[PDB]
Amino acid sequence: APQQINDIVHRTITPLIEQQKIPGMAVAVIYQGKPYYFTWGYADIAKKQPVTQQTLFELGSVSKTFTGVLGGDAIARGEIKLSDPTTKYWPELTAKQWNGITLLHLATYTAGGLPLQVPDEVKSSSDLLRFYQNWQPAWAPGTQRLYANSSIGLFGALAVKPSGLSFEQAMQTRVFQPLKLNHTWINVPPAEEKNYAWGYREGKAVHVSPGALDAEAYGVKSTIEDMARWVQSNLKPLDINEKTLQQGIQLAQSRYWQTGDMYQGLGWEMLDWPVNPDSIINGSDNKIALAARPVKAITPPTPAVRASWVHKTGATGGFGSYVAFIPEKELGIVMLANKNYPNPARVDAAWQILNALQ
Numbered sequence: 001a002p003q004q005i006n007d008i009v010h011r012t013i014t015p016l017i018e019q020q021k022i023p024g025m026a027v028a029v030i031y032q033g034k035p036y037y038f039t040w041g042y043a044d045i046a047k048k049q050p051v052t053q054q055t056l057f058e059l060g061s062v063s064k065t066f067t068g069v070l071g072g073d074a075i076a077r078g079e080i081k082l083s084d085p086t087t088k089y090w091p092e093l094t095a096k097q098w099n100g101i102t103l104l105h106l107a108t109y110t111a112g113g114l115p116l117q118v119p120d121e122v123k124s125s126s127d128l129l130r131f132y133q134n135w136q137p138a139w140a141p142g143t144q145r146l147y148a149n150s151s152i153g154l155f156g157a158l159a160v161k162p163s164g165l166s167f168e169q170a171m172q173t174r175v176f177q178p179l180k181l182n183h184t185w186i187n188v189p190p191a192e193e194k195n196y197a198w199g200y201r202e203g204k205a206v207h208v209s210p211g212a213l214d215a216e217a218y219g220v221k222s223t224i225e226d227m228a229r230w231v232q233s234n235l236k237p238l239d240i241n242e243k244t245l246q247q248g249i250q251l252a253q254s255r256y257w258q259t260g261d262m263y264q265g266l267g268w269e270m271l272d273w274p275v276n277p278d279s280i281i282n283g284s285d286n287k288i289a290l291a292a293r294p295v296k297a298i299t300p301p302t303p304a305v306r307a308s309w310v311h312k313t314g315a316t317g318g319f320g321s322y323v324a325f326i327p328e329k330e331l332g333i334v335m336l337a338n339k340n341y342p343n344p345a346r347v348d349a350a351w352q353i354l355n356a357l358q
């Protein structure tokens with residue numbers, strides 16, 4: 001690696017690992033079309049398995065970027081429209097409160113306060129219909145943003161309905177395979193289990209538990225190499241050969257709503273570059289905990305802005321993930337860890353590395 005990249009990464013990440021007691025970490029810096037990889041510590045403490053460029057980490061809510069892009073691809077295919085009523089793809093959602101709630105609202109957390117989590121009690125598909133039918137919005141659609149799994153999770157499931165493919169099949173066929181993400185999984189196959197890192201919560205080894213709409217909201221697992229490739233694909237979508245996928249990526253980075261300094265895309269979230277870490281942290285949902293914010297509609301949505309800090313945080317019970325890139329500087333970073341550590345620390349470290357290299 002160029003020494004500047006080596007130095008800034010190691011001098012930032014090593015103290016982070018010490019401070020946060022992170023068992024294992026993988027980092028990719030993408031610089032002008034080139035990835036550079038760095039690994040520390042353990043994927044599995046008990047079995048003394050090191051973190052490599054091949055170990056799988058739970059992305060958690062970074063999965064929402066994949067969901068957003070798949071949704072964008074479906075739009076590009078002419079299969080769905082973000083202006084479509086939710087009921088067009090789920091006509092059994094007949095409860096009145098759903099009148100005026102569009103796929104856009106679901107994708108962007110602006111439906112009127114859909115819950116952050118689907119209850120663990122929701123185990124069947126009839127349970128799921130009951131859940132959405134009985135849900136009572138506190139706000140009119142498109143007035144407030146409330147970050148929620150049940151919102152974008154539903155968007156994901158409905159976005160693939162015209163295709164006739166399962167969410168997993170659609171994601172594999174339309175996003176993973178064309179982008180050569182051959183070690184990215186919604187369900188970790190037996191063949192790749194040796195590479196699947198354990199998460200660590202309160203010193204215990206843990207993996208994400210199954211739940212309703214998990215694949216769509218927080219279910220993707222990936223390597224540092226595939227994630228670097230994912231960032232590069234989103235940094236430079238014009239290089240992508242598949243027309244609808246190229247367009248899908250562009251639609252995910254469109255600015256649909258503004259709350260404070262942050263603009264909501266499909267999965268991705270954006271702020272204007274230059275920006276300081278304290279403004280990024282303030283424009284972030286640091287935990288899955290209620291933060292209701294009035295939104296201003298961007299009418300019509302601004303197409304992907306090159307001078308943006310584009311990012312997403314993710315954190316299952318035992319993992320902490322972060323992805324950020326600045327399109328206009330051909331610069332990106334992926335941070336994958338098998339401990340859920342505070343988001344501000346992730347943002348601080350990512351900014352420190354990217355600011356030095358830009």
Ligand SMILES: O=C(O)[C@H]1CC(=O)N(c2ccccc2O)C1
Nearest residue numbers: 060061218287288313314315316
């Ligand atoms: O995005 C984040 O960093 C928070 C917010 C969120 O939805 N998280 C989350 C919650 C449940 C499963 C996976 C997750 O990533 C963690």
